[PDB]
Structure 1
Amino acid sequence: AKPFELLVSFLNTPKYGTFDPTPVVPVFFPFWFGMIVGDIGYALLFYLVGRWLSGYVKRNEPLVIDLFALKLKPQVIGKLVHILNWMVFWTVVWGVIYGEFFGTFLEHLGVFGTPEHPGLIPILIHRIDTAKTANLLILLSVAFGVVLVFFGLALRAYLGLKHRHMAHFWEGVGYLGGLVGVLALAASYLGNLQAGWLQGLMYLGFGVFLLAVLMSRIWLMIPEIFTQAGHILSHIRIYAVGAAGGILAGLLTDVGFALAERLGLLGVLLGLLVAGVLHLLILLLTTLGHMLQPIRLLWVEFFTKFGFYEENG
């Protein structure tokens, strides 16, 4: 938990009397990282790199990168290694959750358990089905954002509870009412159209929202409610990136298989090397952005939004 405090420390200092947001990240960020990690075969190389940097740590290397002319601090790197332990764990377990890996023999024999091939090695996600896999892909990333934004607004409201800026405590639960009302309306629209308790939910939602408006006609607050009502929908980008990476890795592995066998006897000994080269280069290109995406999502939507626009000391 303590190593994760470095990433937050880059930003503005909090004010005493506001709660520490550091323990939020180490439990939530790493499994978000895990969703890009159909690539588990190549993350053992990341573990090897962590071993290399731990070798620098036990060497106590004051490393200097010639390319960027940057100075490295040995005591910082151990925090990085203990941080990377958990994302390697989430790496492994999420790649298992995918079920599909490159050693899947279904292109040659029905060994792995799928609806297509009832084998003895059950694979949860074959990445071909789009009927229920899509809905399952949507649902969890929808739910995580809702839970975290509700927690953030609740804790901001409880901070407003103490000091007498409690005037904005009312608008905090007004956001909650507006969100639950629009959620009820949306779920009633495209769903199975049952609307009774849905009508009750939306009624209470916009009622308690309009109650907060009666505090004062704040000219600035009324449009931005729609904006965070889209920021909650912005949480869906998590599975998009992971699906993009996973299907690319799967198709590249299929290209390796095709160059191996589908070329006949002439292509048997060639395709795997260039397939691995393509995999490693595309990972080198992509993994940096894929790593920074969820951390910046939680970092700007939760962490900055709740309490990190205000004073510092």
Structure 2
Amino acid sequence: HHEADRIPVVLDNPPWAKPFELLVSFLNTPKYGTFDPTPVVPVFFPFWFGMIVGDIGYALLFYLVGRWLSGYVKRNEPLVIDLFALKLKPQVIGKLVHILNWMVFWTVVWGVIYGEFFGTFLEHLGVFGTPEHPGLIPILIHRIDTAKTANLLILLSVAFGVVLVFFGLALRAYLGLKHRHMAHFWEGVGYLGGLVGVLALAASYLGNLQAGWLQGLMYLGFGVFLLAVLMSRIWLMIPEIFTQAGHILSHIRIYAVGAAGGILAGLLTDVGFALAERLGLLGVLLGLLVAGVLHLLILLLTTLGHMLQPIRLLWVEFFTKFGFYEENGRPYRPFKSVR
């Protein structure tokens, strides 16, 4: 099937994986015979959004919005906004409601691990708690105290980064081997060798307690890298490995946005609780009013970027590892009725 760009390309998935084809499709049409990333975004994207937000109250508001959109698709009329120039049909609304259903599922579970409800809530209701302040259950990971939790969280963020990167590189190497693109497999295996070398070297340079197998580990990694560069005769590979290093350490943004949003919400609710406590009996009304209004302004301000970071992480990084972009595929179109 190596007869050039001849074959039109169409995509199909299991029924749960169809809604994410909307997200992945509009970037580019892949070449025929190339692996498609369509099953990877269903499992990864709402997972990352869930660890990002973790706000139960905003998840409930998103569920209310989803109820509004499901009512819209039930009445089966198109939704039109002339101000923003969007006309969309009910089926796209259904695909979006599937997305937000999975979205609020992951948001809710990550929120119950991250028990903060509209920010700090344990001061008013002791269902959650700390070792300091008694409660029904302690917060499993208190994502306010950066003294101990921060290191663990950057560890999982960097772990997600590692997993995603060698998955993409292994896909690239697999395609290079299978399609007789043998040099592409060489580039991929050189990337894997260089990457394991630099990560082992960084782990030794940061927290080593003994040399052991590690010296042979990065020596083998760098040897694989320089051999793969050497016989391939292409010298562009050298700065591109620090480009990959940047792609590895680019994954801290999920923890960063989560900490920022949660601490902002906690400060807002702390202001509300302080207003309730200081003013006495009547302060709770003004405190709740101001808490709700600043909560709404901050949500319509911040929910766009929080949504953008994980899908961006899927877009720029993963699709460029295996080779999504460098050629366009011919789209599929049948000669059938317009109806």
Q: How high is the TM-score relative to the length of structure 2?
A: 0.87
Query: How far 1:105 sits from its partner (Å)?
Result: 6.0
Q: Deviations over 1:213-252 (max 9, x none)?
A: 2213312221111111111100111110011000110111
Consecutive unaligned residues of structure 1, counting only runs of 5 or more, are none
- How far residue 35 of structure 1 moved from its aligned partner, in angstroms, is 2.1
Residues 105-127 of structure 1 show CA distances to partners (whole Å, capped at 9, x for unaligned) of 64368663421124322221333
Question: Does the 8 A contact of 2:194 with 2:225 survive in 1?
Answer: yes
Check 1:83–1:107 CA distance in 2 against 1; reply closer, same or farther (3 A cut).
Answer: closer
Q: Deviations over 1:137-189 (max 9, x none)?
A: 11111001101110110011110012232112112111111111111111111
Q: Residue by residue, what CA displacement relative to the aligned partner does 1:239-279 show, whole Å, maximum 9, x if unpaired? A: 10011000110111000000111233452331111111101
SS in 2 for 1:222: helix
Alignment correspondent of 1:37: 53
Q: Check if 1:204 corresponds to 2:220.
A: yes
Closer, same or farther in 2 for the Cα pair 1:186/1:74, shift >3 Å? same
Compute the displacement of 1:130 (Å).
Answer: 2.2
Greater helix proportion: 1
Q: 1:230 to 1:103 in 2, by over 3 A?
A: closer
| 1:80 aligned partner | 96
CA contact (8 A) 1:100 1:124 kept: no
Distance 1:111-1:238 versus aligned 2 partners, 3 A rule: closer
CA contact under 8 A between 2:55 and 2:108: conserved in structure 1?
no
Q: Is the 8 A contact 2:276 2:284 kept in 1?
A: yes
CA apart distance, 1:36: 2.8
SS of aligned partner of 1:64: strand
Encode CA deviations 1:52-78: one digit per residue, 9 max, x unaligned. 111111111122102123211111111
Contact 2:120 2:270 (8 Å CA) reproduced: no
Q: Is the 8 A contact 2:120 2:269 kept in 1?
A: no
Tell me the distance in 2 between the aligned counterparts of 1:160 and 1:72: 40
Q: What is the CA–CA distance in structure 1 between the aligned matches of 2:114 and 2:287, rounded to whole Å? A: 25
User: Relative to structure 2, which stretch is displaced further, 64-73 or 104-113?
Assistant: 104-113
> After the TM superposition, which of the residue ranges 259-268 and 223-232 deviates more from structure 2?
259-268
Q: Is contact 2:50–2:103 with CA below 8 Å preserved after alignment?
A: yes
More contact order relative to length (CA 8 Å, sep ≥ 6) = 2
- CA separation of 1:118/1:266 partners in 2, compared to 1, >3 Å: closer, same or farther? closer
Structure 2: gaps spanning 5 or more residues = 1-16, 330-339
Q: CA deviation at 1:190?
A: 1.5
Q: Output the CA distance in 2 between the equivalents of 1:202 and 1:107.
A: 50
Alpha-carbon distance change, 106 to 86 in structure 1, aligned in 2, over 3 angstroms: closer
Q: Residues 64 and 120 of structure 1: is their aligned pair in 2 closer, same or farther, counting only changes over 3 Å?
A: closer
Shift of residue 29 of structure 1? 0.5
- Computed over aligned residues only, the root mean square deviation of the Cα atoms, in angstroms, reads 1.8
Q: Which stretch of the first structure deviates more once superposed, 215-224 or 288-297?
A: 215-224
Matched residue count:
313
Contact 1:99 1:122 in 2 (8 A): no
C-alpha separation in 2, matches of 1:70 and 1:110: 45
Q: What's the CA shift string for 1:42-101, capped at 9, x where partnerless?
A: 221111111111111111112210212321111111111111111110011000011233
SS of equivalent residue, structure 1 residue 268? helix
Query: Would you say the 8 A contact 1:100–1:125 is kept in 2?
Result: no
Tell me, what secondary structure is at the counterpart of 1:270?
helix
Partner of 1:106, secondary structure, is coil
> Residue 111 of structure 1 contacts residue 117 of structure 1 at CA under 8 Å; is this kept in 2?
no
Identity of aligned residues (%): 100
